[PDB]
Design a binder for this molecule. Structure first.
Ligand code: VKW
Length: 350
């Protein structure tokens, strides 16, 4: 029997659940009879990204539906979908490419989680929770509810839920302080950079074994750059509800996970609309997608020398922008230092 605290044991069970991995793949319309969990590989995912890039080029060249058919079919040959003896839907537009790129990003984290479960040793005398915990190479500790850091974190959740995201309310169940092995050392060239901020990152429950073991990663070179609003980087929000939407929780699964990370933004490149960039302009360290609403800047507080934008939402003064709320993007994995992990209960009003 494990000596780990009960909330840590529940987190490990949740993140390594095989049935949840299968459920995420069904949601993606993947044919599990043709492509089961165990048959998924890095090689196949990479080849699928490369076919999406071929679809992206054909779309930008203004190719007809008859011309795109062979390229669309190629993607389905690599990643089999659930359609029986029917023709699959045509991937003839930008929205299609973006939906499929997002699915492949998720498959990469699911493949990592399954590879950890299969690639080790079997010993019945050890508690499986302890065995799976060690595979994460992350120190996980419970933050005391009555502590100062828990008070600041609860305030950030309470103040940054947008009015436009009123389909649900959030309840903080557990707060974990996290320390990925070697991340602190990796972050050292950016530890004293200006504009360091504590920001949110929401993701499906099935991605968290991949995130804790490998950290937050950028889409690979094979991936189509137009399938990402501001190119291939790591995306964050200053509004808890903007990131919580990306947990993809529902009435049938109302528990989700969210990260709080220290991001070294430095000199920000401020944008109002889509820009599928390969590299940042000289002297820039990040992208700031300018939102119509921003947390109140006079309510900005400091937690261990890092700025926490926990103010209530007010007008930014920015006109004619495609974003309702801010977003922040970094293009170097070393610019992120993961600090906390929150387990949230979603109370749906719909
Ligand atoms: C190689 C690799 C491994 N796993 C990945 N994926 C997995 C999927 N994950 C989705 C992130 C979702 C998200 N999007 C946001 C946007 Cl678009 C704006 C503002 C905030 C957010 C936010 O909090 N979460 C991306 C990384 N990749 C690319």
């Amino acid at each position: 029997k494990s000596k780990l605290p009960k909330p840590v044991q529940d987190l490990i069970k949740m993140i390594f659940d095989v049935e949840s991995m299968k459920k995420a793949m069904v949601e993606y319309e993947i044919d599990l009879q043709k492509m089961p969990l165990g048959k998924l590989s890095k090689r196949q995912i990479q080849a699928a990204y490369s076919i999406l890039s071929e679809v992206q080029q054909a779309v930008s060249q203004g190719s007809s539906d008859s011309q795109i058919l062979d390229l669309s079919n190629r993607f389905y040959t690599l990643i089999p979908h659930d359609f029986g003896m029917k023709k699959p839907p045509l991937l003839n537009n930008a929205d299609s490419v973006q939906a499929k790129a997002e699915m492949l990003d998720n498959l990469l984290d699911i493949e990592v989680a399954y590879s950890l479960l299969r690639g080790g040793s079997d010993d019945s005398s050890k508690d499986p929770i302890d065995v799976n915990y060690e595979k994460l190479k992350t120190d996980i500790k419970v933050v005391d509810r009555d502590s100062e850091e828990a008070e600041i974190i609860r305030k950030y959740v309470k103040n940054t839920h947008a009015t436009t995201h009123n389909a649900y309310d959030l309840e903080v169940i557990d707060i974990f302080k996290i320390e990925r092995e070697g991340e602190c050392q990796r972050y050292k060239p950016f530890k004293q950079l200006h504009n360091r901020r504590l920001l949110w990152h929401g993701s499906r429950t099935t991605n968290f074994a991949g995130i804790l073991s490998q950290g937050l990663r950028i889409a690979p070179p094979e991936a189509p750059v137009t399938g990402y609003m501001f190119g291939k980087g790591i995306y964050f929000a200053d509004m808890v509800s903007k990131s919580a939407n990306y947990c993809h929780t529902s009435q049938g699964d109302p528990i989700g996970l969210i990260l709080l990370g220290e991001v070294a933004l430095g000199n920000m490149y401020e944008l109002k609309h889509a820009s599928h960039i390969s590299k940042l302009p000289k002297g820039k360290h990040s992208v700031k997608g300018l939102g119509k609403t921003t947390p109140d800047p006079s309510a900005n507080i400091s937690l261990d020398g890092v700025d926490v934008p926990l103010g209530t939402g007010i007008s930014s003064g920015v006109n004619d922008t495609s974003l309702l709320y801010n977003e922040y993007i970094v293009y170097d994995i070393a610019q992120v230092n993961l600090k906390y992990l929150l387990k949230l209960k979603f109370n749906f009003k719909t």
